[PDB]
Amino acid sequence: TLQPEHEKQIKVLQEELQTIEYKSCEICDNDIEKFLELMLAYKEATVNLMQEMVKSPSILHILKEGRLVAFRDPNDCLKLGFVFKVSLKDAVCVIMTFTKPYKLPNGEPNHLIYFPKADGYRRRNFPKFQKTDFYMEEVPVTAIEVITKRKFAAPLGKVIKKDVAALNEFNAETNNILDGKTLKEAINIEKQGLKIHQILLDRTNIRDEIFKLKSIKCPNLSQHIVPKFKAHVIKKKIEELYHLMS
């Protein structure tokens, strides 16, 4: 064949694709795929949203120093941190992370999207985050998925210097957030932008439709979405390697 490598890798991805076990559920077997595609649509909508938000300097007033946000590391893990610095030219943010990468009891990264103002969904998929010694990490603005309303007053500068007075308030606030968390995302997009509102409306529609499903009420959806997710990734990779879809 004129394409040995392509064939090899394709065969591999196919095998790995069909070697996936799907656990049965009387609450997901009906509408879980739609939940998946709609979820990915939500994620994409958020990405584009952040892409359009970083354009207007108003974003600095949204991600002011000490802004609690939920981003994702290269491994698609959800982390909570504070906004320390923002760069418009590079579209990157210096976030101080106080939480380890959220992972299932299995060990694999959680692929579920965190929906603000969703007590049930939270309690079912995101029971609690584990605290970790804070460390500065740069992350692209596009990675941010949730922008909470809560903000850390004390300057992070003193926290970096490890001043006891600052570390007390930092630890207290952090433990406050982790003990009981009812994150609520509120963004004042009315300030500027036109496409922003459209993206917001569309995303809210996607959410209204996704919460209408039955898999959304599932207790163990966080573990049931894994196989479908992996199968999705592998599938897309296969279609690509096949030079298919033009």
Contact residues for Zn ion, defined by CB under 5 A: 25, 27-28, 218, 220, 224
135/114 Cα distance (integer angstroms)? 22
- In the block, tokens 């959806």 appear at 221
CB of 230 to Zn ion, least distance (A): 16
Q: How far apart are the first and last CA of the chain?
A: 21
Give residue number: closest CB to Zn ion: 25
Is 35 or 129 the residue whose CB approaches Zn ion more closely? 35
Is 177 or 218 the residue whose CB approaches Zn ion more closely? 218
Is 29 or 44 the residue whose CB approaches Zn ion more closely? 29
Give just the sign of the alpha carbon dihedral 44, 49, 55, 59. negative
* Cβ-Cβ contacts under 8 Å for 165 (sequence gap 6 or more): 158
Give just the sign of the alpha carbon dihedral 210, 214, 219, 220. negative
CB of 118 to Zn ion, least distance (A): 17
* Main-chain dihedrals φ then ψ at residue 11, nearest 5 degrees: -55, -45
Residue 237 neighbours by CB distance under 10 Å:
15
156/134 Cα distance (integer angstroms)? 11
Is 72 or 224 the residue whose CB approaches Zn ion more closely? 224
Is 22 or 242 the residue whose CB approaches Zn ion more closely? 22
CB of 45 to Zn ion, least distance (A): 25
CB of 221 to Zn ion, least distance (A): 5
